[PDB]
Amino acid sequence: LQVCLPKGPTCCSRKMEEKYQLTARLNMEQLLQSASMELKFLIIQNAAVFQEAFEIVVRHAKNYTNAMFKNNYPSLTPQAFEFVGEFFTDVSLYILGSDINVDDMVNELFDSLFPVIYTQMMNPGLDINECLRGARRDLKVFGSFPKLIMTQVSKSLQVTRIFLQALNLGIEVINTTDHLKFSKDCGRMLTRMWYCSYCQGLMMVKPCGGYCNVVMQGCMAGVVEIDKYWREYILSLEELVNDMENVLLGLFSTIHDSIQYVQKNGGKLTTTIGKLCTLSSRRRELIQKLKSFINFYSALPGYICSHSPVAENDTLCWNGQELVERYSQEPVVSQIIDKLKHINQLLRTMS
């Protein structure tokens, strides 16, 4: 035998020992999944809810901008609907983590907005379109309005994007916990602690609490080191929650004022161009529920021993090799800690 230390005779062969090892693997993975399920479902639910809530906010803001275009500038529709839809589509794509340039969103918005303003509002009456698009930026027709919107929306959209990325990475590490493969030495120690008693012909004998403690602190030496970074992750997320609804909803007022500003200099502009051409409650409840799991990695071996059958009295128990009266007495983890360090730096730099 290579796991079961044969002190007397033995009722199990090498193949039964391999079966016990695989059942030990399955039992450990199931215990980790049961430990991580509540927190995993919490973060998954909140990620989904916040995603839907942000999409609702973006849709409502696009609807409000379209409605104020319908009401105040009917001459700009239906072209106004095209560039508003493209703008808020790129907004949502940026919120959901896609490579979108915020400055490019605002600049394409004003680039599309200026030619229809010139053709329908200032000089009523397809190839000359690009000359107007160039003149928009060359003559700075919109003044400081584009940079104002640029900073106003970049500030909120970056914090929202990093909030969603942080939720997703928390899901990732919590998903990794229950798929953490362990050492072979730990496999043999778990097999001895849970099953090798059956090879010696014992039916209901449980391992000693102290033996479970030494085994668990033996193979979770790496996993426990994640606790510092997980605590810093929780606290940095708390730092970030302490923003985007008001900005996207005031966008229509800002754009309306910018259109007024451009119409203010129409006299010179037409001649020159003719010649030239409950959310905050949710994130608060999420952080208050997430702070209940700050001890997750430090309490994990305690969970494995308190949910595995053990003799807490440490009397008439299995010590891994014999029935005693009293008890005598990683690459994936590195990746988890690396991504936690990265997301924590990103969080702290944001707030």
Binding site: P78, F81, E82, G85
Partner: protein, 49 residues
């Protein structure tokens, strides 16, 4: 059975320009569209005899 003469071709919307779908069959007395599993409202259909 009804034989389709002009089968509807996959359309693409460009710059928010709504492009209609054509359908012509003989012998046919009623021709309707089933977009994404469900029937299209009677008002949307424009029949030609």
């Amino acid at each position: 059975l009804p034989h389709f003469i002009e089968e509807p071709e996959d359309a693409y919307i460009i710059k928010s320009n709504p492009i209609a779908l054509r359908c012509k069959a003989r012998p046919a007395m009623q021709i309707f569209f089933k977009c994404n599993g469900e029937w299209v409202h009677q008002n949307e259909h424009v029949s030609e005899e």
